[PDB]
Symmetry: C3
Subunit: 231 residues, 3 copies
């Protein structure tokens, strides 16, 4: 385990997702409101899944070697298994907040699936130049998601409760900034151009992941917006 310099960030990531999971689980114990239960369910599942996949990376299961550039390159494939489930869940949190129509939810989740799936293919592609073709397609899918979060959702929120509008706005901004960093880290890290070494890359992803999941969740679950308006 300790033979990989990035182990420390995997261990920290595992611990923080674990602690985040336990905290949200305990916090959601005293919740009977059906709307709030949905948000607690979605939001607690996110670090729970991330916990399992961080642990899989820490123990070495979620790592494979991919030959490109005439080298055996360590690729943590478990990230994509995580993101495949957790990024649509995060989008669902946002979509449910603003009472998105079903068509838009399907568009988001579908685009997200394409984003992660093509990122995975890019990560495992042995022809070096083609890795960036997949990166570009995945990034286009991300750009679509970001467009919808801004020019389909933000104007929907203004027509809703002020607490849901303000909470959505914060979470939207957090999401757009944090999510946009991922293709950059991939591009310059071990999966892409290889300018940033894997240990630093792992640190960067860990900071992004904890912020995008536990940070996000802390903001969401402390908000009154997740409760139905009741007396």
């Amino acid at each position: 385990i300790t033979g990989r310099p990035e182990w420390i960030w995997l261990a920290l990531g595992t611990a923080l997702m674990g602690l985040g999971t336990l905290y949200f689980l305990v916090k959601g114990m005293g919740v009977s409101d059906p709307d709030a239960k949905k948000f607690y369910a979605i939001t607690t599942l996110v670090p729970a899944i991330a916990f399992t996949m961080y642990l899989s990376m820490l123990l070495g299961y979620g790592l494979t070697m991919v030959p490109f550039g005439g080298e055996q390159n360590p690729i943590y494939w478990a990230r994509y298994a995580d993101w495949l489930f957790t990024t649509p869940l995060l989008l669902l949190d946002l979509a449910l907040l603003v009472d998105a129509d079903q068509g838009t939810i399907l568009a988001l989740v579908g685009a997200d699936g394409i984003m992660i799936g093509t990122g995975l293919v890019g990560a495992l592609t042995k022809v070096y130049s083609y890795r960036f073709v997949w990166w570009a397609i995945s990034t286009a899918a991300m750009l679509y998601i970001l467009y919808v979060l801004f020019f389909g959702f933000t104007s929907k929120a203004e027509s809703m409760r002020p607490e849901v509008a303000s909470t959505f706005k914060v979470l939207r901004n957090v999401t757009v900034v944090l999510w946009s960093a991922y293709p950059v880290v991939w591009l310059i890290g071990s999966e892409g151009a290889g300018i940033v070494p894997l240990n630093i890359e792992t640190l960067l992803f860990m900071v992004l992941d904890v912020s995008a999941k536990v940070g996000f969740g802390l903001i969401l679950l402390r908000s009154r917006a997740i409760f139905g308006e009741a007396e």
Copy 2:
């Protein structure tokens, strides 16, 4: 096929899931009620999926060799492919019975996914001691599911029709007893401590599977609880 002593239980399992599938399909032919159609759909799909995966194990496709303990260990991975889809379907049957809120359904299905996914990782893990780490996490996810089935669902059922309350109670009890045996069999069988040989392990899983799927389905689909109250 006959070169594996466990083939007989795989063959029997295949036949019983097949027959179970055909029986539920025929039985559901004369059903127009929209609620009953949901239960027939869910409940017929369960042995249909199990049929395909038993057949895959029988024909040898759903088997791989995993090196641990300095041995090549036969691991039937197809079980997890089965359970990944059939256990949430079984939980959906229960959840729909008691008209569970969406948040609770998501919690159940999500926990179930974690249960099966981590069981799969445990099954394929090459570091012997780590297999039991995954077993423990999976078992914790199972315990969460069982907690919800008792302390989130049972009190919901009492507020519903007597036929749905009584049927849920029976199916809940069947589910908790049968499902709890699976981590025990895994732990002592070829995936875990290796005390019980694979042929007996396969027998045990076959008895559990047929009971948890066809047995469960027979109880559910004979009940009046799957029909909306109509005149």
Copy 3:
């Protein structure tokens, strides 16, 4: 890339799915109706997914070699990854058109999953004779889907708006004819009996895919049936 004679059909397929995707995306820009948004979302996702998987086949990622018949046989596994997601989406388009009950939708999607999953197992099976066992099970699942599209849906459509009835009828007929060709092509092509060479097989699948996705989508998205009745 050009080393495989079928590359031309993969390239054409990629281009046509890409163009189809862009066309539906642009066309759906000026849509606010919640019902129409659902259909645009579903129908645009279908060629988008197919685009990615055609590209994966073109670049060689979505190809593996399967030993059977004492030969190394090129099997494009990416087709199943495509179909796993796009065929239920296509069925959802049809089901939503006729306002299918949830039980029937689950039956369709479930049968479809079995159809594609067993086709995949058949495609990767190393025992030649067993490949056709999987083909038969998959074809039985297809026959179930076709039965439901005719003897569960058609009589539902007649009870609905004339525009939805007529559009459903056309799309149903297109779907039944086109989908039925797939098991035939598989059976006689490289996955099955090997009578038709892979380059021609790839052409046939490309024509079917573009017709079943872009052709289908063009018919659906030009129809008034995807809009709620409004003044």
